[model samples]
Target chain A: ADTIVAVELDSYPNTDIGDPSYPHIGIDIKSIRSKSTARWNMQTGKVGTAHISYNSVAKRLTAVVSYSGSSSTTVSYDVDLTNVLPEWVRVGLSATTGLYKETNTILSWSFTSKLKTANALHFSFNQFTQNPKDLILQGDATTDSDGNLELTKVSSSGSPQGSSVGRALFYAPVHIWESSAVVASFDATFTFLIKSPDSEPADGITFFIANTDTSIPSGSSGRLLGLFPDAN
Target chain B: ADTIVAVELDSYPNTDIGDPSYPHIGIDIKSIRSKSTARWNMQTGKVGTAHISYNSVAKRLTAVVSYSGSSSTTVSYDVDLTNVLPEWVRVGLSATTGLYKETNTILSWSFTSKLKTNSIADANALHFSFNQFTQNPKDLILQGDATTDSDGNLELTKVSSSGSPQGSSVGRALFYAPVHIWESSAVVASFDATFTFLIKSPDSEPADGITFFIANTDTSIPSGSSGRLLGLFPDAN
Candidate 1:
C-alpha cells in the first residue's frame, strides 16, 4: 500500500486571500513514502519547493529544501524511478502548493485537471473616492447551470456582510441611452464604497447594468459612478 | 307872331368833378333866363316857358341819396315822374348823407345792370415729415397695374426735407414687399394729402391731389386703391 501526503503553496501573502488587490495561484499535492525523500521545484527563483531523496541500502530518506538560483537553467527534467510504480507514485497536492513550474528536475509526474480553470468570479473593491458627483459604474454577467460558477446577483451594499443591508447594491431599473450588445439584461447592480480624505465613511453608491443588442448612442456611456455621503 | 325864349340850369361850384371814394347819388339843378329880373321859385321851380315865376315854391322835387359805410357798396335810385315837367328844373345839393355821415361823397350814378363779377382764387399749403429710417411711402392709382405707382423700384436714402436729419428716406425701388389682402404690401402709399412723417424719402413725400394705391397678391387685381396710413398715428402737441 502507498501512503499519500497533501501540501499547499501560495504565490501571494495569505492576507490577500479572496481580495481583488491580487490574483491567487495556489497548488496542492498528495502521496509520499514515509521512508522516501521527495522534492519540489519552482521556475522563478522568488520561490522554490522542498527536495526529497531516498536511500535503498539504509532504507532511510532525507528532505532538503533550497531556493532556485536566479540564472539561466534547462527547461526540462528527467526522473529516475527504478523502485516507484507509475500508478502508486503521486507527487503533487492541490490547494497546498503553488502553481506548477516547468523546469529541469529528476521526477516523473502526470498533469492532472486544474481546480480553478477559467472560473469567473465577481470582485469588489472598497475605499475608493468617486471624484465626480454623477459617476455610474455598472457590471453585467451571465451564468451556465452546468458550470462550476453561477451568477446569482452582482450586488453590494453598505454592510460588509451579504445580508440585511436595507438598500441593495444592485437593482432592476436601468437607464440606457441607446442599445448595446454586451449587456444581456437590465439586472446588474453596483454598490459603491467610498471614503473621503477626512477619513469619514460615506453613504454607499448604486448603479445598474443592462443588456443591449445594438450600438449605443454617442456620448452615452462611461460615466463616473455616483457616491453619496451620510445617506443625503 | 309870339316871341320864344330858351332857359338853361346851372349849379354853383359844379365846374369840376371831385373824388369822394364813392359815386354821388343825386345832382343839384339851377335855372337861368333872358330877363334881367330872375324870380326864385321854392315849389315847382322853373324859369322857362316865358314865365317869370316869383311865387314862393314848396319843396316839389325831393332828391334823397343814401350810402352804406362799407369797404365796398352798390347804390341804386329811382326817379318819380309825377312832378311837373317845366322847361328847366333846378336841384339843390346836400352834404349830409343818410348812412355815411361826415364822409365826403365822391359821386353817385344809376345803372341799368349789375356790376361785372370777377373770379377769386385760393392758396393752400401742404407739409409732411419722415419718421422711420427704412420704410418708404408710395402712392398708386391703378388696381392691377404694377407700373402705375409702385414698380417696386423705390429705395430708402438719407434726406433733410423734414424729419430727423440723421434718418434715412425711402426712394424708388425695383422690388418691394408683396402686397396681399391679409399681408402687408411693400409699396405702402398715402392716398390723400397727409402731414404724416416718414423716415424714408426720395420716393416718400406728401403729394397734392394725387391718388395712391398698392399692389396686392391677387393677380387679377394686382393693385388696390390707397389705404390709410397704417403705420403713422395722429399726435397732438
Candidate 2:
C-alpha cells in the first residue's frame, strides 16, 4: 500500500465528527492537497488489519482490510479522512464511551518509504543479465536463485491457497521533478504466465503494486488477500 | 483503499506464529519490486468491501477490507484493493473448502485513488502506534519518522495509538475542544457515537463502549475517558 498520506485503521475509518462507528477496525484515506476522502469497515471486537496506497498523479488510492468473527455474530461499517482538512492537519485517534488498553496493538498504524520506478524492478531471471537487488519473499512466496519468482504456492500454506508478486520499471523512468511534462500521464503494460503446480490451482495468482519498496503482509492465504489485519 | 496487485485469502497473521487462533477473516500483504500483494479470508456468507494504496518514494503498501456484520456481533479485520493492480486482471471471487460451490452475490465494489505517503502506512508503524499507549497518550507513539504528521488537526477517523489523544487530562473533565458545543438545549441537543457490536474468541463483547462526540479542544480523547463527563465540558453540565 503506497502513496499520499495513506492510513489503515484497525478501527474507525471515517471523519463523522461524532458518528456512531466510533471505533471500527478498517481503512480510511485522504488525498494530499485534495479534499476527497474514502473509507471502508472491518469486523469489530477483534484485531483487524488494513493497508492503503495513493497515486497522486492519477488521483487514485487503493487498499484492503481483514478481520475475524461472523457478522451473523458481530458487526462493522465505513469513510474517508479528508473532506475535513486537506493540507497538513494533525491526525487524532480517540476512544468512545469506553476504550480498551491493549498491548502491541496496531490500533491501526504503520510505516512509510519509497522507490524510484526506473530502478525499482528488473527481472533478468536465468536468461537476462543485470545483477539483482535485495530479494524479498514472505508468506507462501518464493523465488529460484535464477529469478523464478513464485508469488505464491499451489497448496494451502497456512491459510488456504493464495499468492502474489510485484516489481517496477527500468533502472530509470520519468520523475515529476525531472520530467518535462509535469503531471504527465504514464502507461504500463506487462504479462506473466502462471504455471499450475497442482493438476488444478486452487484459485489463481494476482499481480499487484507495492510502494513499500520491499514489504510483505505476514497473514495467511485466501479471499481478502493477506493484506487485511495484522495478527497482532 | 486504492491499487492494482490484488489478493483474497483464507487466513493467518502469525503473531506468536504459534498463537492458536482459528477461522480468521482474509487479507494479508506482500510487497516486491515496487508493487504489493495481500491475502485474506472470505466467507461463504455475505458482502464485504476492500481497499488498497501505494507510495512510490516510500516503497509502501496499505490496505483494508470491510465486512457485512453490524460490528455488534463479529470479529473482523482489514485490507485494501487499490494497491496498483487496478486496471484489468481477471476479477475473480471464488470459494474453497472441499469445493463448496456457493455463489450468488456482489451487491457492489467501488474504486478510488490516493498517493503513497500521502495515502498509506506500513505494519510496523501501525503496531508501534498501538504499543506506545497507556491510559495516557505517549509522547513518542509513532513507530517511524514522523510522530507529528499533521497539525492543528482533529481526526474523527480511527484509533491510532500513534495518533493517540494528545490532550491534557484534568482529572477527567475531558474537555475536548470542538467547534460547537452541545448544551442539550440546542437544536442538535443529542448525538450518538452510533458504533455497533461484535467480539473475537473468549469474550463475545466489543470494547469502546460507544458514544460519538466532538470537542472544543479539537483533541483525541484517550481510551477509558468516560461517564456523564465523557470527553465533554464537565463543568458545562
Candidate 3:
C-alpha cells in the first residue's frame, strides 16, 4: 500500500545582497518516484509541476521559486501535497544571489519525511568581496526580530554543510557611510524555525554555520522547542 | 673562264710497308674548288672519283672512293678542278683504332667516309685492336717491330682548321691492344711510303698531322697515335 506525505522546507532570510542584487529560492527534491509526479506552490499562490508524460522519466526534481516579486520586497512559499501518491519524500531550500552574480549571501535549509532517512542538511554562505561576511541563526520559531541574536565571527575552517535539508541563516550588509576619515562597519543576520514532521522528536537535528570571511562574525546561539499537536 | 683546270690537289699510297701498324696513307688539300665543288677519285684500274658533290650555298664539298683488286690491299684518290670551277679540297684517312679488323690473325685496313660543312673531322684512331683479342695479336703490329716513325704515344686532340677542305693525320704507331693487362705495355707501330699522282710530286701537297685517342695516359704527350678505339665500356669515364 502506498502512503501520502507532506514535507515543509524553508530558507533563512538572506541579507548578503548581490550585484544587480536580487534574492532567489531553489527547491531540490531527490530519491522520489522515478515514475511518480510532483507539483509545487509558493506562499504567494504560484504553482508549477513536473511529470512523466510531460517532463522526463528521471526521479530527481528541481523547482526554482523566484523571490523578485512586483516590488523590491521579501517573499515566501509553502508546498502542498494532497491527492498525490508518494511513499517517502525529502525536501531542501536554498536562497542565493541573482543568476551570474557571486556573493557571500546565502540562506538554505532541508528536511525529510522519515526518521531513518533523516540526515543533517549542509549549508554554505558565499560572500563576494575582499572579505565578505556570513551569519546563521537556528530555532523552532518561524519569525525573527533584528535584536534577538548578536552576530558571532566564524573562522574559515568551519565545516558548514552547504547542500543538506535543514534550517540555516545568512546575512551581508552594504556600507553607505560617506566620511573618508570615519571608520566604516556593516553587518546583517538571519533567523528561522524548524517544525519536525514526526509525532515525537527524534535525536534533534544539528545545525552547522560558517562565514566566508572570519573578520565578519555570525551569532547563532539558539534553542529548540518541542511542540504539542493542538498548540495554537 | 670556261676552261677546266686539272690541278693536282693531293694523293696518297694505297698501302705503306714503311708504316706497318697504320699502313694506309692520308693527305690534306686546301684552297681546292672553295670546298663547294671539290671532286676526288681513285685511279687504280677504275677511274672512280671519290663520289663528289658541292653545295654553292654552304661552300663545301665531299667525296668518297673505294678500291679493290690492288696488291697488298691498297686504294688511292685524287682531287681536281672541273667545269671552270676551282675550289680547295682536303683529304683524310682512317686513323682511329676501329678502322681495322683481323682475319685469322692477319690485320687489315679499311676506309669509310663521312662529310661535314665548315667543321673539322673528329680526331679518331686509324689502326685498332684485334677484333677477337684472345685469337689475334693484341697491338696493331707484332712486338719489337719498329718499321715506321713512332710518334711517341698517341693522344687525341681537337681539330685545327675550319672548313670541309681541311684534314689531319694520325701518328705512326696507332696501336690498339684489347687484352693487354696494362695499356703502356701494348706498344705497336705501322709504316707508309711516298707515291706520285700528277706533274707535282707527292711532297708538293702541304701535309699536316693531328692525333686523337680513345684512351691515353697523358693528353699533352705529342703521341700522334690513338689507343683502343672501340669495345669501350659504357661507363668508361
lDDT digits (tens) for residues A4-27 of candidate 2: 222222222223232133333222
- DockQ, cand. 2: 0.03
- Cα deviation of B178 in candidate 3 (Å)? 3.3
lDDT (tens digit, per residue) of candidate 2 on B30-135 = 2101122233333333344333232331223333333554211111123222232322222212111111111112222222222211111211111111211223
lDDT per residue for candidate 3 within A54-86, as digits (tens), equals 000111122222222211111111222211323
Tens-digit lDDT track for model 1 on A1-232? 2212211111222232221122111111111111221222223313322222221111112222223333211111112122222212212211111121111111111111110101112222221122212112122111122210111122232111111012112121222211111111000111111211212111111111112111111221111011111111
In candidate 2, chain A reaches a TM of: 0.32
Error of 1 at A205 (Å): 41
For every candidate, C-alpha RMSD to the true structure in Å? 59.3, 26.3, 49.8
Which of the predicted structures, 1 or 2, would earn the higher lDDT when compared with the native?
2
Candidate 3 local lDDT, residue B67: 34
lDDT of 3 by residue, B1-237 (tens): 111111112233211212112222222222111112222332322311121222111112222233332212212222322212222111111221222211001122222121211111111123232212232333433221111212221112111222112123232222443211111111111111111111111232322211111122111112332222111111112
Supply the TM-score for candidate 2: 0.21
Each candidate's TM vs. the true structure? 0.12, 0.21, 0.13
Q: On residues B125-145, what C-alpha lDDT tens digit does candidate 1 reach at each position?
A: 111222221223342111111
Q: Which 10-residue window in model 1 chain B sums to the lowest lDDT?
A: B113-122
Assess the local accuracy of residue A152 in candidate 2 as a C-alpha lDDT between 0 and 100.
42
Looking at candidate 1, what is the lDDT of residue B26?
19
